[PDB]
Amino acid sequence: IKSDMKIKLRMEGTVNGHKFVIEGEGEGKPYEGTQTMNLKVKEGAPLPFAYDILTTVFNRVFAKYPKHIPDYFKQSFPEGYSWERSMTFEDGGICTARNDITLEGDCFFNEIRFDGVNFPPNGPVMQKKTLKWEPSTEKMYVRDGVLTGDINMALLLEGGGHYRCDFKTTYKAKKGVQLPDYHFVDHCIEILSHDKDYNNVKLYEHAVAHSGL
Amino acid sequence: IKSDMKIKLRMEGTVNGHKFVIEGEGEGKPYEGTQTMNLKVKEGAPLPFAYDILTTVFNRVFAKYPKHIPDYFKQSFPEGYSWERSMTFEDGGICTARNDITLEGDCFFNEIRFDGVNFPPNGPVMQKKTLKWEPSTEKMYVRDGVLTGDINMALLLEGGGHYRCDFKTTYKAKKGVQLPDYHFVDHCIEILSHDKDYNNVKLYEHAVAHSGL
Amino acid sequence: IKSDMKIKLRMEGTVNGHKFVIEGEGEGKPYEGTQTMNLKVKEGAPLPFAYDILTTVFNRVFAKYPKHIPDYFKQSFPEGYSWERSMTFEDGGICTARNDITLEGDCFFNEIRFDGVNFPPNGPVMQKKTLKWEPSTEKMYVRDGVLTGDINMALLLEGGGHYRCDFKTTYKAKKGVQLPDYHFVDHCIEILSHDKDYNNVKLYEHAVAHSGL
Amino acid sequence: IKSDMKIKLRMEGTVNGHKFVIEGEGEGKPYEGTQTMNLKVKEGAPLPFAYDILTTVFNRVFAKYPKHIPDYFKQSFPEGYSWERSMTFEDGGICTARNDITLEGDCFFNEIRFDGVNFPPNGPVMQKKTLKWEPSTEKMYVRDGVLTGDINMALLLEGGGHYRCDFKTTYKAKKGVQLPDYHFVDHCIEILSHDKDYNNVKLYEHAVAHSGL
Numbered sequence A, B, C, D: 001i002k003s004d005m006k007i008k009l010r011m012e013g014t015v016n017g018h019k020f021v022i023e024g025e026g027e028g029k030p031y032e033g034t035q036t037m038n039l040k041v042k043e044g045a046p047l048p049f050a051y052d053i054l055t056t057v058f059n060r061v062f063a064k065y066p067k068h069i070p071d072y073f074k075q076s077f078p079e080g081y082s083w084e085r086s087m088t089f090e091d092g093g094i095c096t097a098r099n100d101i102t103l104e105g106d107c108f109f110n111e112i113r114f115d116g117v118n119f120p121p122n123g124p125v126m127q128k129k130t131l132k133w134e135p136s137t138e139k140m141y142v143r144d145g146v147l148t149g150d151i152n153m154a155l156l157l158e159g160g161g162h163y164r165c166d167f168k169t170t171y172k173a174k175k176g177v178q179l180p181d182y183h184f185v186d187h188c189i190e191i192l193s194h195d196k197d198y199n200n201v202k203l204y205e206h207a208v209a210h211s212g213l
Helices: none
Strands: A005-015 A018-029 A034-043 A081-089 A094-104 A107-117 A130-133 A136-143 A146-157 A162-173 A183-194 A200-210 B005-015 B018-029 B034-043 B081-089 B094-104 B107-117 B130-133 B136-143 B146-157 B162-173 B183-194 B200-210 C005-015 C018-029 C034-043 C081-089 C094-104 C107-117 C130-133 C136-143 C146-157 C162-173 C183-194 C200-210 D005-015 D018-029 D034-043 D081-089 D094-104 D107-117 D130-133 D136-143 D146-157 D162-173 D183-194 D200-210
Touching: A005 A034, A081 B107, A094 B094, A094 B107, A107 B081, A107 B094, A107 B107, A130 A183, A136 A162, A136 D136, A136 D146, A136 D162, A146 D136, A146 D146, A162 D136, B005 B034, B130 B183, B136 B162, B136 C136, B136 C146, B136 C162, B146 C136, B146 C146, B162 C136, C005 C034, C081 D107, C094 D094, C094 D107, C107 D081, C107 D094, C107 D107, C130 C183, C136 C162, D005 D034, D130 D183, D136 D162
Parallel strands: A005 A107, B005 B107, C005 C107, D005 D107
Antiparallel strands: A005 A018, A018 A034, A034 A200, A081 A094, A081 A162, A094 A107, A130 A146, A136 A146, A136 A183, A146 A162, A183 A200, B005 B018, B018 B034, B034 B200, B081 B094, B081 B162, B094 B107, B130 B146, B136 B146, B136 B183, B146 B162, B183 B200, C005 C018, C018 C034, C034 C200, C081 C094, C081 C162, C094 C107, C130 C146, C136 C146, C136 C183, C146 C162, C183 C200, D005 D018, D018 D034, D034 D200, D081 D094, D081 D162, D094 D107, D130 D146, D136 D146, D136 D183, D146 D162, D183 D200
16 A cells, blocks of 8 residues: 555446446545545436435545554555445435455455435435535444444535434454554545536545544 | 236345345235245355345235225336335344336236345344244335335344344335325235255245224 | 223423423223323423323333233233333434333322423424324334333324334333233324313323234 | 633433432533533432443533634523433433523533433443443534534443444524534543442543534
8 A cells, every 4th residue: 555546446326216337536645545536427327316425435545544543444455345334314315335445556446336215305315405525523443343433424405404414334354453442534525526417526535533632 | 916916026135245146936916915935046145144134125016905095006007116125223234125116917027126234243134043024014104205114123033032123115106196094014924945045935925904903 | 900990190301491290190991901091281381392292101001912912011010010212203303201100009100201302493393283193003022031112103294294203112020020922012092182282181092912914 | 601610510310210310510611621520429329320321411611612613602601502412322222311501600500301211231331331431523513593413422331342322412592693514523521530339420521623624
């Protein structure tokens, strides 16, 4: 894991019955906790739901970990790691997602599956009324020998107000690593640019681990 | 929809990272609320998780509806209907599932996707310690012009005790149908026979709609 | 526990900051699974929230248990039992409640505490837009040597539609009793009459235990 | 609200049927985001449950708010504010709590009610196996004209591992105040000293508001 790394991904999913495929190519700085990616809808264009529900699915290797907190993710390579996540929205929408992350040369490959169910037809996801995710702080703790992260996430909505989602992600190293004590990862994710129907999206994330107050 | 109907299905899914395909062929009696199916694992054998998590995913057409409760499901054909479901287990395991149900001649075809995440590695699902689902009563109510069913489900476990799961299923007719008032559907599902690793399973369900006490 | 029993109760609670006391006197038939009660607001009249949230707090002794299902509740007397319940509404409202049930002569005394928080100010509870609870089926199972009941409950709302609440009640006998296997209790509760601000309410419940389909 | 303020409180509650009263006296620095309190069990000693479940119930006035984030709490006085909270533990334990906060001279008075239900008898709360709350980051957002804070909280347990609780607190000013945009409050709470059965406890909290990464 070098100061500069490339990223490639493929997501296949279904949300509200709508099948899609998205591919991404980007780059990031693992030790600065930053990454940027260009994403293209390859099947199912135009997506009928809020693109924002996908974006946090598009790798905690890209998080700046201070010396005092063991870095579960960077420690996991070359073998790498996978994660699974549930996203429980406050109106009963539920998404499941996974990523199997491999490293070849200077490039992370991401094999992703995303599924979304029970979104109300007049809700902000199906009506595409989301603006952005707010920054967040993920709570990281060991459970059954692997790392779990829980996050209170919120989408800022058109015309004001927020739409809440609770994330639970289970991260699993493919080798033994030094496990961290309870800690936090601050995140900020943003769509830098997109075209009209989000067929093309440029995405960015900054993340930094810390020990709280 | 005749007194006797055939059923065919294909499920593709991933649970705990493990990819699989299962195909099923069966028959049922829509007006008696009964059905039986033979299921075969076509890819991913042997499944590393409790087969029981799948079984309720393997069609509320097969539910005996009395004259006084509009039958959302039978009314929906020939066009048919689809459903989406989240299954929230008490230990944080979450599954998402969907079925798109079509009718050709005397045969229902079921296109199914199933995804499971966040199952604890020492839990009853990953350790295959489930015996059966208990019978249940699904609560059916209209929400946003479509039908929602919520169920408090429980797996009876090896060595006693239960493992709870909450189902929320959204059922969507592909045409206009007379919508029912709040009602119930009693269910009982059972694996009639299986081989050692559940590569072959014979499954049965009985369901009856009612208006409660 | 005779064919006819009297009931007296006192509830103290706070909902949305509003303190109240309600007292009740009634009668029921334990073996027929029926009871009726007259309730009077003694402090905090007029209640600023939907009275319906209280009613299921105003004793599973009054449930008709068939010979084949051990009756945890009737078995518990003369010593009696207590219960605790959480009520999780779909809009984030949460109530907690408890009842300590004693028997003196032919009369059950009920010491009740009820607390409600996080109800949205424009929601159906604070705006008093509830009509009734729908009938329900409670799922009963043993957990840690005591009985747990889970219920998918729904309030029918003014102008149509439902408002969902999930009940979890833990029932604790004050002596050893034969524990039942997994079973169900059907319920129907209804306000028979009330005055304008629900200062006076006549309430009824019918409940019957069964083994499902 | 001065650089130094006094605090007095009274909590009445019931957890697992066990009634108690606790009184507290302390002091804090509202603009430094710190406070300390001495708490005494006045009724129900010795408490049969983990004292830690109470501690975050023992005032966001004591949070350091930077100039760029409107301070909902400090703005609310002299009239003051109240809050309600639900605490949803991962094993089904649920607590409800409220605080009505008044200011007289240099002293905040806190009228508190706390109720806890559905705690498993062999769980860490009833078995008193909690060590401390981990630091946290509360997510603050406006909803229905008032402020809501959600927190992923975790108790560190004896012998390792964590026990998760999700907090939702609704904060209500008793006058009009400038409402803040989405923000965060970092918290750290600690028991500085206690006697054997927690009849006497010295408690401390540090909290700082921020805008995330």
